[PDB]
Design a protein around this ligand. Structure first.
Ligand code: CA
Ligand code: MG
Ligand code: MG
Length: 430
DNA sequence: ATTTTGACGCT
DNA sequence: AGCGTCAAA
């Protein structure tokens, strides 16, 4: 009752660029704008593997992970842009730089947590309080929320999408109590006003469109973001949670898309997130462990406490290449040549990182997979990273993996290597 | 033969 | 420290 916390203390947004790599290529090549297009890596094997797809192409059924030849079967007029290749491998530099562009715009508004190359969480609590004192009890106009959906509305006693959006927003604003500065729904609404402004700034200054979720925690912000894509934002209030969760498959909640979510479904015999409310915390802890149990118990009620971490920069810098099927590396020289290629790209990125962000990596992680191994990594070993020098780094990696060669012969490597991975970690200020 | 990434938990 | 899980374009 009067003491049960409700997790309404923060305003958190999640901003996710729409079909990010496609928008990077469409900005660069206007011929691709407003067309079914996709971004592909490599070209030789089945036309390349698709990694990003415009909404126009998704309408034909084109997806990520599809081979371009197969996507062309679904969408004969599909346009393709190829990821740059350098030193024999895919090079993602253009997209990393466009991402930095967007994160720097977002950082002007608030503390952000970089969640991936194209997504960031935003803690808007303080900015919301400032906007609320500036507003001075003034009602919030629908005009300040031109692309906002209110999850769960309209409800109760037009057939076009934008009509429904405005009806729901009108119901929400009609209800709002702008008299109380501590009102969580008012705080979320002001959050949404700020996110509209941030999204406008991103589009004005980069050309890129994005979607956003606004709620009281990261999990609900992330779920909200996906409810109305592309180029829209969705507010998920605390009161919307019971109905939203009553038909929400467990796997849709972040961290439950894999084995743990599968076990929640199997062990408890449920399908939707709301059904979790019928278990005690101790029951959930018994099945899924103390940490997971407590998390599930609060989450199914819409409550989560994971903070938006102040981290705008990635914590590791890695380079990896697969050598699938018959291309697996079977000679010592091949292995050394590819270690050099990886180390040269890594050196270039590390040097740029040191100049831009005043830090230096101190550990080099080398990972390999051998033909036959079921796991993603067959071997992970670390060593000192003392100089941003590709020849030294490639030598150190070879030194640390050379004992993996079963082969009795000199020049041959067995079992053949199907993957190489170099990752610089453990950054220190410089 | 999705590939190339990046964060975080367990022990 | 090394391994596993979950997620991203
Ligand atoms: Ca995206
Ligand atoms: Mg995303
Ligand atoms: Mg995606």
């Amino acid at each position: 009752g009067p003491h049960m916390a409700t997790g309404q203390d923060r305003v958190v947004a999640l901003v996710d660029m729409d079909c990010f790599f496609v928008q990077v290529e469409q900005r660069q090549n206007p011929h691709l704008r407003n067309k079914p297009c996709a971004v592909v890596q490599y070209k030789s094997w089945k036309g390349g593997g698709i990694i990003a797809v415009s909404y126009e192409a998704r309408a034909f059924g084109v997806t990520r992970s599809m081979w371009a030849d197969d996507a062309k079967k679904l969408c004969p007029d599909l346009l393709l842009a190829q990821v740059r290749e350098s030193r024999g491998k895919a090079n993602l530099t253009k997209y990393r730089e466009a991402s930095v562009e967007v994160m720097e715009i977002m950082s002007r508004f608030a503390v952000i947590e970089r969640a991936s190359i194209d997504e960031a969480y935003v803690d808007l609590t303080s900015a919301v309080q400032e906007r609320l004192q500036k507003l001075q009890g003034q009602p919030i106009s629908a005009d300040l929320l031109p692309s906002t959906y209110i999850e769960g509305l309209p409800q109760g006693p037009t057939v076009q999408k934008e009509g429904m959006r405005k009806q729901g927003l009108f119901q929400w604003l009609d209800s709002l109590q702008i008299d109380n500065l501590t009102s969580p729904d008012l705080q979320l609404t002001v959050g949404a006003v700020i996110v509209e402004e941030m999204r406008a700034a991103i589009e004005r200054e980069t050309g890129f469109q994005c979607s956003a979720g606004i709620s009281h925690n990261k999990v609900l912000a992330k779920l909200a973001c996906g409810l109305n894509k592309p180029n829209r934002q969705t507010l998920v209030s605390h009161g919307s949670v019971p109905q939203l969760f009553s038909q929400m498959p467990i796997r849709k909640i972040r961290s439950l898309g894999g084995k743990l979510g599968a076990s929640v479904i199997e062990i408890l015999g449920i399908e939707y997130m709301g059904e979790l409310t019928q278990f005690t915390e101790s029951q959930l802890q018994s099945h899924f462990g103390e940490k997971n149990g407590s998390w599930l118990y609060a989450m199914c009620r819409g409550i989560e406490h994971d903070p938006v971490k102040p981290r705008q920069l990635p914590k590791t810098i890695g380079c990896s290449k697969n050598f699938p099927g018959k291309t697996a590396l079977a000679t010592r020289e091949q292995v050394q040549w590819w270690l050099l290629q990886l180390a040269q790209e890594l050196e270039e990125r590390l040097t740029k990182d040191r100049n831009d962000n005043d830090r230096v990596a101190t550990q080099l992680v080398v990972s390999i997979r051998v033909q036959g191994d079921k796991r993603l990594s067959s071997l992970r070993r670390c060593c000192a990273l003392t100089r941003y020098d590709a020849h030294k780094m490639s030598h150190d990696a070879f030194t640390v993996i050379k004992n993996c060669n079963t082969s009795g012969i000199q020049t041959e490597w067995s079992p053949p290597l199907t993957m190489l991975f170099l990752c610089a970690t453990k950054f220190s200020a410089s």
